[PDB]
Design a protein around this ligand. Structure first.
Ligand code: HEM
Ligand code: HEM
Ligand code: HEM
Ligand code: HEM
Ligand SMILES: C[C@]12CC[C@H]3[C@@H](CCC4=CC(=O)CC[C@@]43C)[C@@H]1CC[C@@H]2O
Ligand SMILES: C[C@]12CC[C@H]3[C@@H](CCC4=CC(=O)CC[C@@]43C)[C@@H]1CC[C@@H]2O
Ligand SMILES: C[C@]12CC[C@H]3[C@@H](CCC4=CC(=O)CC[C@@]43C)[C@@H]1CC[C@@H]2O
Ligand SMILES: C[C@]12CC[C@H]3[C@@H](CCC4=CC(=O)CC[C@@]43C)[C@@H]1CC[C@@H]2O
Ligand SMILES: [Cl-]
Ligand SMILES: [Cl-]
Ligand SMILES: [Cl-]
Ligand SMILES: [Cl-]
Ligand SMILES: [K+]
Ligand SMILES: [K+]
Ligand SMILES: [K+]
Ligand SMILES: [K+]
Lengths: 405, 405, 405, 405
């Protein structure tokens, strides 16, 4: 049945159907997010244009529905938007000051110092896979390998103690799940804020060799970051650094296992692993929808107008399936396509993902290490039967049962 | 493709297909349980006969595969069989001594003293549903209502402190999941044993108004139960009292919601709630397979012989679908059928479930309370899309998204 | 994807799906009629109760959406509600005065005088079928037989000249089609009003042996009907007398042709033709939705409240599929079922169809005459491929290709 | 079930299946046209050869079935063949005289004088779409835009008065529909002949600036056309000029809406509109079968022989799907294919469509005007559910429900 507003299903029962419908109704279309209306950008070229348009800001105070009190903290998606001041909420000249220390710490050269730590965690978790898969038993690749690894890496970078990481994982699972009761979710949001507040206090009194300390003590240059800004950057870096990288690792393994000819190309050195990672990001990336941007004034696109105060969502999954950019086979996984590295699954413009080099590095180490260690790894359950968790905006897989072979 | 040994799929990908194949290949057929062979009893009349045959015992030491060292603690299903001495592991005259105090405490008349406690827990968890479902939000009926309720009831009966119940739930989820690494599963089994050992120590020093204390301090009649026997009975009562009752509540709601005409019959008083519960137990009961029985000698059934030392599994789900007993519509949910209360989903013979009256009482209170409180309750996800957890022998649903209406 | 408001599709793409969804969400549920909200009564028992509830009136001025100017004449369904004063728009004591002369003229005994006229028209149109079907050609059963017949009968009863009937058919097709541009639809509504206004003028100056003349000149008893009341009754009698009877004839033929065993039962005298007509009315009747009733005050039904001013639609098709009344096979056509004549497809309460005896008489003459004349009549197109016309509230078939045989 | 004669289904229930079966059974195969046998040419190269073969003539008197009286005016397709003398019925030297005045009037340079008239009608009917689609209402693109436009254009060219065009539309709908009773169809054929006879009389007494007058008064050169020849040319020009162009406009919109990437290419100027029109003509053109040609003697094709007197049909739709000419993707709509302008959907040889430049001009004006005016135009009904009218030889769509957006 036809409707002009596409309701994003919170259970993610038909992700493929929604992504195709969003593309067909694009590049700009109305969507419904749990009773709240917004515009969705589903086209590649229009996304690049709007992601650099200074009239679209992240600040929730620019949202006419927030101004009128129509949307409140009872909205189950409010934790994705109504967050503390950070690089994720600011635009304009002040944005660069909130990003500079993080981008400096996340350059390829800076990450070379972190590479041996990543190698150690990959090796340790491969040992866990080996023990778990003994005697031909079925193993959850997510819980044993892909789920803990990015948390370990981002915790080492930021300075999160090893004993605290299980609690963070429990919090994020409740934070992202649509099934979490809203009173519990807001409570989890408060508990996470309290944890990172105390972590910043702990690093202020006793700084260490970690990014959090660098945010706290920026040394020469610029106004010091406020407590809210340090906590906000910390919160965004851990959340994204963990959530998105877990998805990239799992979807890459799923794509390569279901395309064994292409897995052979990367294992034999005919196609680079980073090219396989790029096509995974384009075809099956971590972000489904990015909430949210708001128009500070009317934005005229010629045929259509984005009214002042309207909310605008970047539908990165639909954007990756753009037929105008990638061709008629955009819905297929093909690491040999020429437009693989043309994706914008890390974003575009000022808010482009600062951890993109780290995400690429983690996947580029973990993936060949996994398939070299277990060359006969294969699913114990048909890959197409692996369901998504009920997470509206993130491409989160539930579990990944495999046999080591 | 045809095969003579039916492999029970650990991912529960096709439960309907397996149940029909087990019925078609029955009433006695060979099955494969994660590489271990056994016979499956899938016929109603043959089950009743074998459940009273004194030549089939629960003791794992009668298993020829256990005697020969072929099956070890590395088998992922070993926690269902190699357990402490209890009413679940003994046969013959000593069996009655390990059951008498429990059956005396679990009669319908004895349970009348527990009814107000059950009513309070149902009312409290319905309040949780109301808060979780505020503003039309989607609610997990399992996590908010059906999952905690039987744990609170069996904990009140046995004397498990309120603060310890979340840890028990965590243990049982790992105990039952096939995805749990076997070293972790064996550790959880050890941690559960340590908890219940200390609980018996705590109740020995300071007995209370609970069944555990009754097992510890009987009257002058009969030999006192050993420490192993008390712990063993306690472990079986909590595990079954929780695990099976959660499934009954969820499957009853699923069956009634997908058959609103039949839900109307029970709410309007034309069919009793206990009849709707009986048909749920027959059609979609908590136990899929019951492990395990072993022949002390050759058992001649006419057309076939069960060799001495062979393992025998009661496939209660397939048994409930017996067409010879229930008719050509055995695969349909119909609370008006005449053979509903003729099911043996609680077992038969000496090992018949001792908590059947409590399971019936919990469901008979919780179900009408749920539908009276939320008369417009309905699924937020198509009922047929609710998956089973990867638990081989138990009918465990993953989650139950609903709207209060 | 799940939604709490069921949008009635104007293209009638999935009538079966919508009818089942309306039943499943009933007996009272919210619907969307081309952007306008209303409640739909989809349950049999609740319909009978509300159709006799004096707090639900037909007068559009009781509609809060009409009072507030939210709904206007630009709404494509406004011609079904905002009509002239007649028996269709009034409730209470004045309702009986607007119905008495019509009900007196439409009793079974009064209709005996019209039977030879119906017989002549059936015979004439069967002759048309014979000529149209010459040399084995395909014939549109609708255009040649079922479409003109009820117009000729209701025109003979009301006094519509033979030469004017083709224009009336053209008007009604535009009136009912959702595809008609709204400015054109409003013009057709005005042209129909002008025609019937002049017809009443013509009958006032020169009365005849017809019902229209009877409405104009009653006896000394009671106040004479106003001009608006005569025109209004005339318009309702012609519209319903034509539109609904065409559908009944076509759906009866479709149901019997797709169930030749049941057609054999009526032709061989084991089941009466009026019973086959009753099951057609229950299973595939002319009315899909009846617009519209409005609550003069809050109506408490126990679990729900119909707010004052809300619009209430009788979904007669969904009501006919009531499983609580007709059993588990309610979606099947079965003239031997015991509940066939228990349908309320003619309505219930004061507004019950006054022409039901005439509709039954027309079908009871036409159907056996058709099958006696052409015993080998059969479809030239698969019956399930016959589409509905885009008419939201009426069960209107597009065309009915047959061969005479 | 296999048969050597392919029966063309008069209801067009499976047009895709028949077209593929005709191609698979080609390039020359037997078909059944409502009980009348003929040969069908379904291959591209064989069509070009036979369309220039002087042994295949249009004259029905060369048909052995017509000579023997086997086929008569009772055949429902006889109006496509047994027509008055015109350019459509003559072959050889006399053919050019019946075509010269028409081809001279239909050159691209001559049509430049008609372009402002086409622009005015497109603008007027776009205004009708705007009014019909007000307030988001569904609009029939056929009835409001595509159906009247070619009639207006061909009427302006030929000199048909504006007030007479609705009657012509009504006649042609009955003429083409297989559901029309044959006695009514022959009557419609007579009424059309009477209308065009009087139109030629009217233009003879008072000639105007139109093609009909040019046919009547050819000025210098050649024998004057007879009354039968003028009426015959007039009849063919209006019938084809209207019927085929309506189909081209609707199928082009359907193809572009279902391929939004390709619609973007033409709207952005990367592919010419005339290239999109060419691929629409190749893939989904107006003519399905062209009746009919007859062999004046035995025609030897090497492997097969067309016997003298046999009827030969050009299956232009199947011809457009020729895999030998267009490749393995011939069944796909792709305006970027290299063989798009290689189609013969306008025919080939002496009888090639004389109005091809006019059809291309009408579509090349109307299509960009439509999408420029309503850039967000989209279907209100799934495009694949738009059915064909029961017209055997013409690709006639029933209705085209859209929203303006
Ligand atoms: C694993 C693959 C990853 C993907 C596909 C991804 C993608 C994205 C996207 C789409 C955005 C928002 C762009 C927008 O505003 O529209 C973003 C922002 C961000 N990401 Fe990533 N990310 C990934 C991993 C990471 C990692 C490893 C980190 C490390 C901490 C990280 C930290 C951040 C932060 C802090 C922002 C906010 C930047 C800003 O708003 O200025 N992400 N990412
Ligand atoms: C909710 C529905 C329940 C079902 C369908 C069920 C079913 C069963 C079955 C099939 C057996 C084993 C029969 C055999 O040996 O083949 C069993 C045994 C047992 N059940 Fe239940 N059960 C339920 C709830 C409960 C409850 C509420 C308790 C309370 C503590 C309980 C405690 C036990 C114990 C201790 C045994 C072992 C008895 C023995 O081996 O002697 N179960 N049950
Ligand atoms: C062919 C089968 C027919 C069916 C299934 C049918 C059904 C109905 C229904 C459902 C209603 C409205 C009930 C309500 O208010 O909810 C109605 C009212 C009415 N019908 Fe019929 N009808 C049929 C034929 C006819 C015929 C032959 C006539 C003759 C004139 C007629 C004239 C009317 C009139 C005037 C009303 C308005 C009565 C009032 O509102 O008081 N209908 N009918
Ligand atoms: C809209 C797209 C059109 C298509 C695809 C089309 C196609 C055709 C075809 C296939 C034929 C017969 C070729 C044969 O004999 O096998 C034909 C003939 C003819 N068409 Fe068109 N036509 C179109 C539009 C028009 C228009 C706009 C006119 C203007 C009057 C027209 C007038 C004629 C006439 C008079 C003939 C007979 C020519 C002859 O037999 O010498 N057609 N057309
Ligand atoms: C959306 C995101 C996950 C959720 C993050 C978001 C950055 C801002 C942020 C700060 C919080 O306090 C909660 C999590 C969020 C909302 C991240 C940007 C890229 C990644 O996908
Ligand atoms: C199988 C069962 C769940 C697992 C229980 C079993 C009784 C014996 C038992 C004692 C333990 O220590 C672990 C759990 C088990 C193995 C129960 C009998 C009925 C219920 O379904
Ligand atoms: C709805 C109906 C068809 C449309 C009729 C309606 C009665 C009232 C009426 C008067 C009019 O002027 C237009 C048609 C309508 C709106 C009829 C009652 C039963 C039949 O189905
Ligand atoms: C077949 C046709 C439609 C019907 C036209 C035909 C040209 C000859 C002709 C003269 C008539 O009198 C009726 C219509 C017909 C039969 C046209 C040629 C191309 C177009 O498709
Ligand atoms: Cl990349
Ligand atoms: Cl029971
Ligand atoms: Cl009836
Ligand atoms: Cl072309
Ligand atoms: K666009
Ligand atoms: K593909
Ligand atoms: K050939
Ligand atoms: K294809």
């Amino acid at each position: 049945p036809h409707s002009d507003t596409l309701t994003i299903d919170p259970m993610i029962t038909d992700l493929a159907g929604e992504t195709s419908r969003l593309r067909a109704a694009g590049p700009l279309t109305r969507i419904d997010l749990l009773g709240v209306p917004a515009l969705a950008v589903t086209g590649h070229t229009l996304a690049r244009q709007l992601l650099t348009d200074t009239r679209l800001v992240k600040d929730i105070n620019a949202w006419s529905l927030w101004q009128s009190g129509t949307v409140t903290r009872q909205w189950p998606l409010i934790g994705m938007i109504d967050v503390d001041r950070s690089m994720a909420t600011v635009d304009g000249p002040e944005h660069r000051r909130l990003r500079i220390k993080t981008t400096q710490a996340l350059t390829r050269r800076a990450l070379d110092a972190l590479k041996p730590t990543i190698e150690r965690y990959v090796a340790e978790l491969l040992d866990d896979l080996e023990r778990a898969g003994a005697d031909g038993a079925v193993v959850d690749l997510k819980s044993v390998f892909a789920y803990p690894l990015p948390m370990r890496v981002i915790s080492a970078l930021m300075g999160v103690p090893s004993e605290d990481q299980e609690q963070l994982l429990t919090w994020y699972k409740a934070f992202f799940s649509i099934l979490t009761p809203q009173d519990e979710r807001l409570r989890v949001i408060d508990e996470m804020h309290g944890y990172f507040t105390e972590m910043v206090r702990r690093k202020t009194a006793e700084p260490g060799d970690d990014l959090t300390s660098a945010l706290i003590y920026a040394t020469d240059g610029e106004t010091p970051l406020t407590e809210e800004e340090v906590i906000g950057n910390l919160q965004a870096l851990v959340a994204a650094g963990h959530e998105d990288t877990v998805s990239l690792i799992l979807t890459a393994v799923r794509a390569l296992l279901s395309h064994p000819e292409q897995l052979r190309l990367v294992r034999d050195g005919e196609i680079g692993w980073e090219t396989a990672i790029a096509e995974t990001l384009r075809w099956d990336g971590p972000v489904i929808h990015l909430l949210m941007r708001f128009a500070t004034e009317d934005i005229d696109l010629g045929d259509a107008v984005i009214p002042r105060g309207e909310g605008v969502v970047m539908s990165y999954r639909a954007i990756g399936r753009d037929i105008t950019v990638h061709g008629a086979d955009a819905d297929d996984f093909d690491i040999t396509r020429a437009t693989a590295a043309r994706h914008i699954s890390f974003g575009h413009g000022p808010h482009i993902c600062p951890g993109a080099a780290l995400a690429r590095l983690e996947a580029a180490i973990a993936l060949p290490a996994l398939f070299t260690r277990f060359p006969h790894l294969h699913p114990a359950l048909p890959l197409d039967q692996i369901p998504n968790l009920p997470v509206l905006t993130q491409n989160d897989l539930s579990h990944f049962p495999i046999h080591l072979g």
